[PDB]
Amino acid sequence: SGFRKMAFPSGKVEGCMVQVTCGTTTLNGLWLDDVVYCPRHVICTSEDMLNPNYEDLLIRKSNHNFLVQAGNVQLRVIGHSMQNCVLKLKVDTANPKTPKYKFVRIQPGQTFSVLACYNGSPSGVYQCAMRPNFTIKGSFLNGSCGSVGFNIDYDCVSFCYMHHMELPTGVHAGTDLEGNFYGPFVDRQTAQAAGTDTTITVNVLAWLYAAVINGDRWFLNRFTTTLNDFNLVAMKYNYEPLTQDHVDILGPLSAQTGIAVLDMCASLKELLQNGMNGRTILGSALLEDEFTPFDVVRQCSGVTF
Amino acid sequence: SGFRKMAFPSGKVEGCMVQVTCGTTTLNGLWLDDVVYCPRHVICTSEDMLNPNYEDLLIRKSNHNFLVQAGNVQLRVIGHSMQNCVLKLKVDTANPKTPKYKFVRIQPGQTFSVLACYNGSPSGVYQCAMRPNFTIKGSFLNGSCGSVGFNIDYDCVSFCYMHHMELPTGVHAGTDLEGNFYGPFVDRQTAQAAGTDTTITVNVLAWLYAAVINGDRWFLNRFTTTLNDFNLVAMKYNYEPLTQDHVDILGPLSAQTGIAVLDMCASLKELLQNGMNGRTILGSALLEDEFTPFDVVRQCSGVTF
């Protein structure tokens, strides 16, 4: 028993992290087979970031200008190309630690693990969610760019995020491994404000199921609701609308606990309207939304990799 | 910027996890050099756990009764011994992935990463603290015993915890890697109640410094206090007494922010007396105590391994 914010084991990803230096800029790259992926802004000075023309800046770069180091050992760059907002540095050596992997583009509400790195060296691992406004709330210092987000299914690493940008409000923006930003964000030091950070309702419900499974029960009430009634309350409290698809996804947790999804929605409705009254659920004083239904099933069942 | 509950990268520990089976009991072992460490209760049936005599149960076990599997590959057991509440299974093969390591016994308030494992396979990593009552609040299902807690200093893994027991209240007890339980707990299925789970004051203060560094500032006030005045409030709210040693440990964070430790104590005093008033600090609605001053410096400075 017990329920923790839990990251995937990071070893398979640690074996892929390298340092990429272009001129005075050092950040992280992801070495898979004979390609190193990194943010294209490695080619920019702080000055360049105000209004960069990446194709023009890239003309002044040769293979030998991209310094790629895997631990103490230099990798030879035999080609480079830009794909959207990432560079692909072709190296003459396949990463011998390349795991089974996929590139996936995740939906808002999906969770993933981040391996925060500096100078190609892993510093820590934490679990976070693609927010509905396509930001993430990470922990990223200067030099963390090129750190990646991922999920693991048994032995296959699904890479879903590469870190590029901190907004002036201290939230984070980045790309998939095809170099396409999540949301409207761009790799330029400019006015970019995030939209409403709404709460991921289906994840809050999953976490309330996790609470019941782990013996936190006080918030269960005598009420039910409908999707339409619940969504009137969701809208007021800046929660994502709950759809029949979300209800279907929560089916297994409903089955496990015998608590109908709409009954749990009624519990959530009362928590939104009445607050916590100084009580906690799984050690939180707020409704946690960075566990997916799949995360709750996985953690509550002990799935391994 | 941003501040996350962050675990150490788990790769060095993943390379040490094995499955240990004795009769019908399977759990995890830690393979370092030519020794596998596991909970001695691997030799017990569920029935045995009510009142086990471990020396007597162990007489009926031979080397060949301890099935040790590293991935798909069986390890040959050439000796076994009991040290306190752990077994040391001597194997004929040194773990080729053995990292630099130490065994440390941590103090209450210290944090560490747990690599939750099942059948010798890592499931996830999370960060937790030795509670003042010598429990931990983990995420442990049946089969997770032998999962370990650790810290990393650059390339050296300090192993501090091995998981043994869940108390009837769903909190967790275990040993150091010398097999000595933290606190008064025993490896028997018996009446064991935890003492007061007090709040780790020095860690709450460290986290309030982390909040200021990351721009969460609303709780700073015009007040100061003394250790003795603060401790009158700490005692009322089941916080650990703050000592001059804690004040000294917070010195670097005080220096970094220009906020005197006793001024931050006055901010904490007001938060305890007035509550949060529906506000959050670093995305929490409660005062977080599972970051040490060293964790806050490490995360805020980007230290790597």
**Measured between alpha carbons, how far is A111 from A5 in angstroms, rounded to an integer?**
11
Q: Report the C-alpha dihedral over residues A271, A274, A279, A282, rounded to 10 degrees.
A: 10
Vertex A112: Cα angle to B149 and A13 (nearest 5): 65
Where does residue B216 fall: left (phi above 0), alpha (psi -120 to 50 degrees), or beta otherwise?
beta
| Minimum Cα–Cα distance from B298: chain A residue | A123
Q: What are phi and psi of B229, to 5 degrees?
A: -65, -45
User: What CA–CA distance (Å, rounded) separates B129 from A138?
Assistant: 21
For residues A63 and A77, is the Cβ–Cβ distance under 8 A?
A: yes
Of residues B110, B95, B122, B105, the one with CA closest to residue B158: B105
CA A67 to chain centre: 27
Residues of B in contact with A118 (CB under 8 A): 302, 304
Within 13 A of B276's CA, how many CA atoms are on the CB side?
19
| Alpha carbons B188 and A280: distance in angstroms, whole number | 30
Write down all domains in chain B, each with its CATH number in brackets: 1-14+100-197 (2.40.10.10), 15-99 (2.40.10.10), 198-301 (1.10.1840.10)
Closest Cα in chain A, distance from residue B60 (Å): 31
CB-nearest partner of A10 from B11, B137, B284: B11
* Nearest CA-CA distance, residue B59 and chain A, Å: 32
One-letter amino acid for residue A115 of the chain: L
List of long-range contacts for A169-173, beta carbons under 8 Å, 24+ apart: A169/A193, A169/A194, A170/B1, A170/B2, A170/B214, A170/B215, A171/A131, A171/A135, A171/A136, A171/A137, A171/A197, A171/B2, A172/A135, A172/A136, A172/A137, A172/A138, A172/A140, A172/B2, A173/A134, A173/A135, A173/A136
Q: Which of A96, A42, A69, A26 is nearest to A77 (CA)?
A: A69
Contact B2 A278 (CB under 8 A): no
Instruction: Please state, in angstroms and rounded to a whole number, the distance separating the CA atoms of residues A238 and A196.
Output: 8
Specify the amino acid at residue A32. Answer: L
Q: Which residue has tokens 């996936």? A: A104
By DSSP bridging, strand B66-70 and strand A172-175 are unpaired
B130 vs chain A: nearest CA distance in angstroms?
A: 15
A181 has which bridge partners? Answer: A175
Query: How many residues comprise chain A?
Result: 305
d(CA B189, CA B140): 16
Inspect the interface and report whether the beta carbons of A10 and B6 lie closer than 8 Å: no
Which among B38, B44, B117, B145 is annotated as catalytic? Answer: B145
Distance CA B229, CA B41 (A): 47
Question: Nearest CA to CA, how far is B246 from chain A (Å)?
Answer: 25
Is B123 part of the contact surface with chain A (CB cutoff 8 Å)?
Answer: yes
Q: How far apart are CA B301 and CA B305, in angstroms?
A: 13
Partners of B276 on chain A (C-beta within 8 Å) are 285
Beta-carbon separation of B2 and A215 below 8 A: no
Best probe of the B interface among A5, A97, A118, A125, by most B CBs < 10 A, is A125
Query: Resolution of the experimental model in angstroms, please?
Result: 1.2
A15-74 residues touching B, CB cutoff 8 A: 15
Q: Which of A16, A22, A38, A41 is catalytic?
A: A41
Structure token pair of residue B68: 């040790």
For residue A204, count other CB atoms closer than 10 A to its CB.
25
- For residues A230 and A233, what is the distance between their CA atoms, to the nearest angstrom? 5
**Is A65:A80 a contact under the CB 8 Å cutoff?**
no
Q: Which residues pair with B19 in a beta bridge?
A: B28, B69
CA distance B272 to A298: 36
Tokens of B261: 């430790």
Does residue B80 have an active-site annotation? no
- In chain A, the largest separation of any two C-alpha atoms, in whole Å, equals 68
Residues of B whose CB is below 8 A from A144: 302
CB B101 within 8 A of CB B157: yes
Catalytic annotation present for A41: yes
**B135 and B173 in contact (C-beta within 8 Å)?**
yes
Handedness of CA A213, A217, A222, A223 (dihedral sign): negative
Q: And the tokens for A124?
A: 């820590």
Q: CA Rg, chain B, in Å?
A: 21
* A146 contacts on B by Cβ (under 8 Å): none
What span, in angstroms and rounded, lies between the C-alpha atoms of B159 and B162? 8
* DSSP β-ladder status, B100-103 and B156-166: parallel
Residue B279 near chain A (CB below 8 Å): no
Pairing of strands A100-103, A156-166: parallel
Size of interface A-B (CB pairs under 8 A): 161
- Report d(CA A122, CA B7) in Å as an integer: 11
- CA–CA min distance B144, chain A (Å): 8
Task: Determine the Cα angle at B40 with ends B34 and B45, to 5°.
Answer: 130
B258: DSSP letter = T
Question: Can you give the three-state secondary structure of chain A, one letter per residue?
Answer: CCCCCCECCCHHHHCCEEEEEECCEEEEEEEECCEEEEEHHHHCCCCHHHCCCHHHHHHCCCHHHEEEEECCEEECEEEEEEECCEEEEEECCCCCCCCEEEECCCCCCCEEEEEEEECCEEEEEEEEECCCCCCECCCCCCCCCCCEEEEEECCEEEEEEEEEEECCCCCEEEECCCCCECCCCCCCCCCCCCCCCCECHHHHHHHHHHHHHCCCCCCCCCCCCCHHHHHHHHHHCCECCCCHHHHHHCHHHHHHHCCCHHHHHHHHHHHHHHCCCCCCECCECCCCCCCCHHHHHHHHHCCCC
Own/partner long-range contacts of A276-281 (Cβ < 8 Å, ≥24 apart): A276/B285, A278/B275, A279/A218, A279/A219, A280/A216, A280/B286, A281/A207, A281/A208, A281/A211, A281/A216, A281/A219
- For A9, which of B14, B166, B304 is closest by C-beta distance? B14
Instruction: Say yes or no for a CB contact (<8 Å) between B304 and A166.
Output: no
Q: Under a CB-based contact definition with an 8 Å cutoff, are residues A144 and B302 in contact?
A: yes
- Decide: A274 and A193 in contact? Cβ < 8 Å: no
User: Quick check: B223 contacting A, CB < 8 Å?
Assistant: no
Rounded-to-integer distance, Cα A30 and Cα A178, Å: 12
Report how this structure was experimentally obtained: X-ray
Task: Say whether B93 sits in a helix, a strand or coil.
Answer: coil
Residue from the list A12, A124, A171 with its beta carbon closest to the beta carbon of B8? A124
Q: Could you tell me the CA-to-CA distances from A243 to A231, A262, A272 in Å, in that order?
A: 9, 11, 18
Q: Is A171 on the interface with B (CB under 8 A)?
A: yes
Q: Which tokens is B161 given?
A: 């915890």
Residues 6+ apart with CB under 8 A from B228: none
Distance from CA of B263 to the nearest CA of A (A): 25
Measured CA to CA, the distance from residue A286 to residue A237 in angstroms comes to 13
- From A9, A170, A286, residue closest to B125, measured CB to CB: A9
